[PDB]
Each structure stands twice: as structure tokens, then as C-alpha cells.
Design a protein around this nucleic acid. Structure first.
Length: 210
DNA sequence: TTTTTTTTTTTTTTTTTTTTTTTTTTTTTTTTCCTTTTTTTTTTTTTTTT
């Protein structure tokens, strides 16, 4: 019962990770998005107890459409509580592969010293983290979550020039928001929210990531 | 004679409990009662004595 449930939750977490990577604009093929449970069992195995697949076997390397040298690692550590040793191992892998972006799918949580390592390591390499329970649901597919589109600096500048706005006068969204963590939004970006309206059909609002 | 391995000691968070503090619809009209009080010190008065 452990092997089948573990394979099912690993397949669901991998599907959510690949949908998250496709929503961020990274190069993801259609068969990876439409990968079934039986396809996952054929490709990676179905017995997670005897390392089929291993937790280090499910590492996901993905690249961006516009800039092919901007890539993401997705790590799947097997330890439930993550120390500084595995974080340092992943960081050394990031220097020796020259990649600035990675997401660590932790199981239980992280030590606060490792969180401080993520904080002060941040403006050279971005090292995000995600719980396993948070990645069992694609948040953007919920009926209460409208469409979120990340904007470039040109669209933000055009918005502030058109509406005569300053950046502090806009609405705000926290950096710890599940949608902002899903899209990987850093501080200063502006997210465009397109929602359905019952009086005008649809409505576009703008929020500043703080 | 140096390296690993155990022990120690901080270090930062966590979690629960306790404490604190602030709040409690809008307007209007009539009476009643109180707006000192006993204690201590000071000053004047009255009676008594030589």
C-alpha cells in the first residue's frame, strides 16, 4: 500500500511541477503535461521502496523558451527535515552546472538555518522551496482563482504611464501568496489579474508583489 | 602526531499559556438628589486663686 500510494503522489507532484514550469514560460513538451499514471509507471518504475524510481532520479531540468541558458532545477530530496548539508550539495550542483534557479520539493519542512541560507544566498541564485502537501493541488485550476499573468517591466511602465500611477498606490499581493509562490514572483513585479464579472463580463486588475 | 567522533553550548524557533486592553445602535422627554465630614489644631472664654 505504501508503494502504490507513493507512486501516485509522486506522479501527481511531478505533474503539478511540470504544469508550474509550463505556466512560468519554461519549455515543457505536451506529453510531459499529459503524462498518465501508467506512463509514469512505465518511464520511472512503480516501486519507490526499492529505488524505482529513486527520489534523486526524479530531478527535473527545464529550460526557458526565450533564453535557452536560463534553466530551472527541480530537486526531490528524500529527507523529511532538510538541513544545510543537502542545501549545500544542491548549491554546489548549481555552481558546477551554472544554473541560477531551482525548486526544492521538501516533504516535511526545513530548518530555519536552511531558510536563512536561502535568504542570504538569494541574489546570486534563486532557491525556492515547496512542501509536498502544497504541490498535490494545482492552485490556478481552482474555480476561485482567476487568471494571473506576470508582466514585464515594459508593460508595468506602460501601465503606470497610462493610469498616471505610482507603484505604492497600486493594490498589493504578498510574496508568500500561494499564487505568487506558484509563479515565482519576486518583489517589485506587477501581476495582472483577469477575472470574470457579473456586471461587465470580465475585469482586469493589477497588483504589486510586496 | 593528525583526523574523526562524541560532547557541549548556544541559537533560534515553537507552542502554549497568561496578561492586557479595548469595545459594546441613534435620537428625544420628564423627575429627584447632591454639589461633605469627622478630626485635629488653634483661639477665645470662663472660672479660680493669691
Amino acid at each position: 500500500m505504501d508503494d502504490e500510494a507513493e507512486t501516485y503522489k509522486l506522479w501527481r507532484i511531478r505533474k503539478t511541477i511540470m504544469q508550474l514550469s509550463h505556466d512560468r514560460g519554461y519549455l515543457v513538451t505536451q506529453d510531459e503535461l499529459d503524462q498518465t499514471l501508467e506512463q509514469f509507471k512505465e518511464m520511472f518504475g512503480d516501486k519507490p521502496s526499492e529505488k524505482r524510481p529513486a527520489r534523486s532520479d526524479l530531478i527535473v531540468l527545464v529550460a526557458h523558451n526565450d533564453d535557452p541558458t536560463d534553466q530551472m532545477f527541480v530537486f526531490f530530496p528524500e529527507e523529511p527535515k532538510i538541513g544545510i548539508k543537502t542545501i549545500k550539495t544542491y548549491c554546489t550542483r548549481m555552481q558546477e552546472e551554472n544554473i541560477h534557479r531551482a525548486i526544492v520539493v521538501v516533504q516535511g519542512g526545513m530548518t530555519p538555518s536552511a531558510k536563512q541560507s536561502l535568504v542570504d544566498m538569494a541574489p546570486k541564485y534563486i532557491l525556492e522551496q515547496f512542501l509536498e502537501s502544497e504541490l498535490l493541488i494545482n492552485i490556478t485550476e481552482h474555480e476561485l482563482v482567476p487568471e494571473h499573468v506576470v508582466m514585464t517591466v515594459e508593460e508595468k511602465q506602460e501601465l503606470l504611464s497610462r493610469y498616471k500611477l505610482k507603484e505604492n498606490m497600486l493594490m498589493r499581493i504578498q510574496a508568500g501568496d500561494p499564487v505568487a509562490r506558484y509563479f515565482g514572483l519576486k518583489r517589485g513585479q506587477v501581476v495582472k489579474i483577469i477575472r470574470s464579472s457579473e456586471t461587465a463580463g470580465r475585469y482586469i486588475s493589477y497588483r504589486l508583489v510586496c
